[PDB]
Design a protein around this ligand. Structure first.
Ligand code: FAD
Ligand code: FAD
Ligand code: C18
Ligand code: C18
Lengths: 499, 494
């Protein structure tokens, strides 16, 4: 019943908030809808896999908050396999390569690809991380889909196809579904194109030994009976001196403040008294989550390595159920496995199939991409379609359709009386990720500490020391990358010389 | 506790469903979240206005279901005033006109405007009302916004500005917010551009004497204690023999079937056991409602009529708070008033102001457009910002952003075990309107009657005889309207 702060949601963000408040000496309760903590993270354990992350998994350089939290909890990381060659599969053929981006040989196509990535980052620099709606051309960019932007920017089909895959993979949505402003913000607030797409030196560099679910689990262990499982929140009443929070299983909690640590749209599952202000009322109906099935195929051995393939495949084309894979083999070299994502419309299309039918399609794809009959011999399979989750709404995160971020973005983390907002969606650095979950949960917690007069205003937002274990190499460009013309830039140059 | 069918929501759709089931001899309960019925319809009564519709108000020819239901309940209509001239206000000047479309005099602009409207209806002819995702170009059109389509189609700024207003007014959303496929479906399923934009012979022809709220109120009267007010549904459990429906005020209802008669996205406010199927689970997060403030300014007399203006104003441009008005004067000629809509982003922008600040802005606009100082002397004001409503989500209706209708549209009215789906959003003719509310409520009710083996499958969807009181006249076009080239067509000829 009675406490200082009720945290709604026991994912990483809610757990990080609750831990900070608990450590500060406050009495906290975490009300979690599911029979488990972790939310969009979920580590399955069984004899066949030992452990496997079926939700969020990867961490990397510049994600210093999740790294610090995990380290404090006694967790370790290991590096995702990228020793051997990556594969880009396009128009039914595989092209091995090294470095984060597939090589492009055609001079015109090269200019177009180079300009595409450069322009994404150029536009990103115009967008404040903490206020994307303040970008000089916010309205113009928000009123266009990523599809429209790619149609304008990409003078080759090659670049447009790879860019489309980029968007699908980053935000588990179609290019025509999402705002260009929001997408450009999302990439920029992860540190840019190179950082977001990279394994070595990027977001996919590492995983936690034993799974990411341990973050939320170990915090639950620290908090003991303060975490209440199978307590879906249905009602929040702020009309009286103390806030009243009611659960589906009929319990009532009373608190000074509340942290909402759930996906923004999932605030719709709560009836509010008094009603939410107009802007938040409408915002929470305008912010869907993406669509993805995470699929892990197990093999007797990591046989791809013998062919000098690391297990990374970037697979273009409608027929391919999976557009991206990574080696998911244990650091010990056993439980050989390939992780793949079925993205956006394909998650909808292929959800119709049986688990066995999806396994077959994935193996047949991998056999072709890897030129390896061994891919047709899986030993085990695990998968999770996040689209079916009542208490997530999708994965990885919330996307903004055209027009929404400028009109409603400012209220995303604006407090509503004594309700403060956590959740990765409200972060300003790696929003959408476990890192963002920690940033937002701790910031929301500190907003409450400030409201209680326990800390000064300048302590609400806090910098994070760089990890000593996972140092971040800077993102660099070459002179040629900086200065080579775009395709229309080249055509202008040609038209000028021929005059 | 125990009944045959629980209807969630006591708007027109839920009430129409409940009435049909009740009349068929089933025991029905309507669970309504608010302390009132009517939902997106709301008639306010006070001495100053007598009555005023602050929500849905207009009905017209081809909307035979709402007309039949209202007539049965003892309601009458009257005609919205369209005797005198309409006004199109463009680049700071008023241009009076007659007929449903504002005239264009420049020959290039004429071809562009003519082509715009014609093309909307041309495209609509390929979109099945009951399955827009089956349009031959469904994916191509769904993956584009209306902004993109208008950018392609409109060779003049004049046409683009008017087309933009058209979209904003029809669906209370920006052109860049909405799917082209969904918008073209929406217009087509109302009978096309002429029918949707017309007062005389169209959707805005009539209002109900005493207000549209009387539809839901009078059905509540018929059902008596079967309607439970202030019972927001929070939980639906279908794991057992009978469906269990729980309300926020702790009550439990048990039924054979449920009708969900709430806006699709408001399904999110209900916790489901077992969880919803994947497609519906995500669908209900992808379907927002539009944004609108409905504003009624009252005057001593309908002074505009003296200048041979009917009170209809179509007002282009960003600066104007209100893009469209109609005369809201009572049939008796008293309670003179102008109804105006503050649409889409302007609803968001102007919500920050006080009621008095909005009144001043509207009066000053109307004085400019009507060319009358009388507009500066209001006697009363009423308004309603539908964006603030927890149990509507907005008004008039649900819009589909790009990519959604093709991917999720088919599950809108697909039953989930023993839950059937009503609500105007699930209609196939005048979806978005009170007419669609009736169609969907009655159809959902009949799905349940069929599930119970009480009627055959071919009786689930039923035709409606034409109203004798509000007969429809045909929509016509001229030879020149049909055959004049577009701007690029004229350029190809050159
Ligand atoms: C699903 C997914 C996510 C993911 C990804 C791959 C998949 C398939 N890959 C990632 C990766 O490699 N690295 C990374 O950093 N992130 C990755 N993501 C995203 C990541 O999982 C999320 O960003 C993060 O886990 C989000 O954390 P957050 O704490 O913000 O949100 P949550 O996990 O969704 O937790 C919300 C909790 O609230 C509970 N809930 C929901 N509604 C209620 C109500 N009404 N009452 C009480 N509790 C509620 C949920 O059950 C959940 O536990
Ligand atoms: C708001 C509006 C609507 C409108 C319009 C102008 C405005 C400002 N102009 C119209 C017009 O001139 N002519 C016309 O035909 N329609 C016009 N519209 C739209 C019209 O009002 C709607 O199409 C129609 O009213 C919709 O009816 P429907 O029955 O389908 O939906 P509803 O009215 O929203 O009713 C839903 C009810 O459900 C209750 N509710 C919501 N959640 C719950 C839960 N969880 N539990 C129980 N009840 C719930 C709502 O309170 C509501 O009463
Ligand atoms: C930021 N989005 C999350 C994300 C999770 C992931 O597991 O792999 C990615 C791989 C990505 O890029 C791989 C890549 C490499 C080369 C070209 C293209 Cl298009 C994409 C981008 C994002 C991700
Ligand atoms: C479809 N939407 C509902 C609707 C309610 C209404 O009250 O007036 C309208 C007026 C409309 O059109 C008026 C009009 C006339 C001439 C040109 C343009 Cl752009 C619009 C269209 C829809 C409506």
């Amino acid at each position: 019943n009675k406490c200082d702060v009720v945290v709604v949601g026991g994912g990483i963000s809610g757990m990080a908030a609750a831990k900070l408040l608990h450590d500060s000496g406050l009495n906290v309760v975490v009300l979690e809808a599911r029979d488990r903590v972790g939310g969009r993270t979920y580590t399955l354990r069984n004899q066949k896999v030992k452990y496997v992350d079926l939700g969020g998994s990867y961490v990397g350089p510049t994600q210093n908050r999740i790294l610090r939290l995990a380290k404090e909890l006694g967790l370790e990381t290991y590096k995702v396999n990228e020793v051997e060659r990556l594969i880009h599969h396009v128009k039914g053929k595989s092209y091995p390569f090294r470095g984060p981006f597939p090589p492009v040989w055609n001079p015109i196509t090269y200019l177009d690809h180079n300009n595409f990535w450069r322009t994404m980052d150029d536009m990103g620099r115009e967008i404040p991380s903490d206020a994307p709606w303040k970008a000089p051309l916010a309205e113009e960019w928000d009123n266009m889909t990523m599809k429209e932007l790619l149609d304008k920017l990409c003078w080759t089909e090659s670049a447009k196809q790879l860019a489309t895959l980029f968007v699908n993979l980053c935000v588990t949505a179609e290019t025509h579904e999402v705002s260009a402003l929001w997408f450009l913000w999302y990439v920029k607030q992860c540190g840019g194109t190179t950082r977001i797409i990279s394994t070595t030196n990027g977001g996919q560099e590492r995983k936690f030994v034993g799974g990411s679910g341990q973050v939320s689990e170990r915090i639950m262990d620290l908090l003991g009976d303060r975490v209440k499982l199978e307590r879906p929140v249905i009602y929040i009443d702020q009309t009286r001196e103390n806030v009243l929070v009611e659960t589906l299983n009929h319990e009532m909690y009373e608190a000074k403040y509340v942290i909402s640590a759930i996906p923004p749209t999932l605030g719709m599952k709560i009836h509010f008294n008094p009603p939410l202000p107009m802007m938040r009322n409408q915002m929470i109906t305008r912010v869907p989550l993406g669509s993805v099935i995470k699929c892990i195929v197990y093999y007797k051995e990591p046989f791809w390595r013998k062919k000098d393939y690391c297990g990374t495949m970037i697979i273009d084309g409608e027929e391919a159920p999976v557009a991206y894979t990574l080696d998911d083999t244990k650091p010990e070299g056993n439980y050989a496995a390939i992780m793949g994502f079925i993205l956006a419309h394909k998650a909808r299309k292929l959800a119709r199939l049986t688990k066995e039918e999806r396994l077959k399609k994935l193996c047949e794809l991998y056999a072709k991409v890897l030129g390896s009959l061994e891919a047709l011999e899986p030993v085990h399979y695990e998968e999770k379609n996040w689209c079916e989750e009542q208490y997530s709404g999708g994965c990885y995160t919330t996307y903004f359709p055209p027009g929404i971020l400028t009109q409603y973005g400012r209220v995303l983390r604006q407090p509503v009386d004594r309700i403060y907002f956590a959740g990765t969606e409200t972060a300003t650095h790696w929003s959408g990720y476990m890192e963002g979950a920690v940033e937002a949960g701790e910031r929301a917690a500190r907003e409450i500490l400030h409201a209680m007069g326990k800390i000064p205003e300048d302590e609400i937002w806090q910098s994070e020391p760089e990890s000593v274990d996972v140092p971040a190499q800077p993102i660099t460009t070459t002179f040629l990358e900086r200065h080579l013309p775009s395709v229309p830039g080249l055509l202008r140059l040609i038209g000028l010389t021929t005059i």
